[PDB]
């Protein structure tokens, strides 16, 4: 399990630690989309932070079931529900909470359990692509993981009205990789 920088948006040097955690607050109304991202271990974005992601880079192909775990780090007094839904490859990000509610989803009550782990049934970087003039064995299997505020963030006087969450990912034991491919932006300088 490595920390998945889902919140890969701030770049300002001193806010880089912020990429590790995204937040939830009272201000967010029921149904609102909290966050979203794809199940693309090797491609740019969130997965680059995970160790899995970095290792996928030294390989050309791969496939297996993944597994993301969410950790609520808010005050102990807070409670509420988050809907976490997975839209297989092809299925477009669900319009709203209710439509996402019909897909493979999980209601998460961080009032009961501080952690929850989602399994991504399958992802396969096998479909070849020869775009520009540089051939890249790409995904297309961009499975999607959406997260909606099933209920709002509830808290008693005395507790902060914001809390963060941490994404941790890894692959199941059925994971595999093929074709050693050394590639890197970081190299030994002269």
């Amino acid at each position, epitope marked *: 399990e490595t920390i998945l920088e889902v919140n890969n*948006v*701030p*770049t*300002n040097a001193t*806010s880089l630690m912020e990429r590790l955690r995204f937040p939830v*607050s009272a*201000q*967010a*109304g*029921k149904g*609102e989309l909290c966050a979203v991202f794809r199940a693309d271990p090797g491609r740019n974005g969130p997965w680059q932070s995970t160790l899995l992601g970095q290792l996928c880079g030294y390989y050309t192909q791969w496939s297996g079931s993944l597994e993301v775990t969410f950790m609520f780090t808010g005050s102990f007094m807070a409670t509420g529900k988050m809907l976490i839904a997975y839209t297989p490859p092809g299925g477009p990000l669900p319009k709203d909470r209710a439509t996402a509610m019909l897909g493979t989803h999980v209601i998460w009550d961080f009032g009961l359990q501080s952690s929850v782990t989602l399994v991504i049934p399958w992802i396969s970087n096998t479909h070849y692509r020869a775009h520009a003039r540089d051939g890249v064995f790409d995904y297309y299997t961009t499975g999607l993981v959406s997260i909606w505020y099933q209920t*709002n963030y509830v808290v008693p006087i005395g507790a902060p009205n914001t809390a963060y969450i941490i994404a941790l990912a890894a692959a199941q034991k059925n994971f595999t990789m093929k074709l050693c491919k050394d590639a890197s932006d970081i190299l030994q300088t002269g």
Partner: antibody
Amino acid sequence: EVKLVESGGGSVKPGGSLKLSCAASGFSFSTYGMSWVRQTPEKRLEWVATISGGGGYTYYPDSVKGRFTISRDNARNILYLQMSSLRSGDTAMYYCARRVTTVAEYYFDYWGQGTTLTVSS
Amino acid sequence: DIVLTQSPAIMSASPGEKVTMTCSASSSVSYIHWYQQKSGTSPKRWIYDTSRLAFGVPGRFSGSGSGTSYSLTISSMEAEDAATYYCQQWSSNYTFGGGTNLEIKR
């Protein structure tokens, strides 16, 4: 207290360029998105730009997208708005506003006291 | 390209009676917010998400509306409220309303 106090402006001839700035006080500036709004001689209110909590995204309306550019420097807690190729329709009183998050939408909590821009020959 | 029309533009209450200002939209809208502007001073925050009141606002102010017609209601009216009240929409192009000059009757 939360204070938004802005600076710049005056008379400018049409075609000239100008830069407006707003200074923040008494709230963590980086954690908020910040917008400018203009008021024509005490009647009409028109949104002109927003900036994300960090660098991130900028957003503009279709009356201004092209000439104005909104910026922030999160070391001195200060917004910036440079306006180039200023026109006669740009005369107004410009406020800097803080944008908070609600259940779904956004809302402007505090407004500064504004600077006045008169574009005229 | 989403316009908000406010009626009426000018109003006069006794005071001690109620006041109903209206913000109508050209298309269906999710929520509406309200500001206040007294003379010489900038706009102040008043109502958000249609029915929630900003910390300062007296409890005598109210908010409702659904779809395309929303309204700010005041009961009862007091000489300290006289200002211009603007509505605002947050769905697409962030538009303001024309305002409503609320005034004291004598």
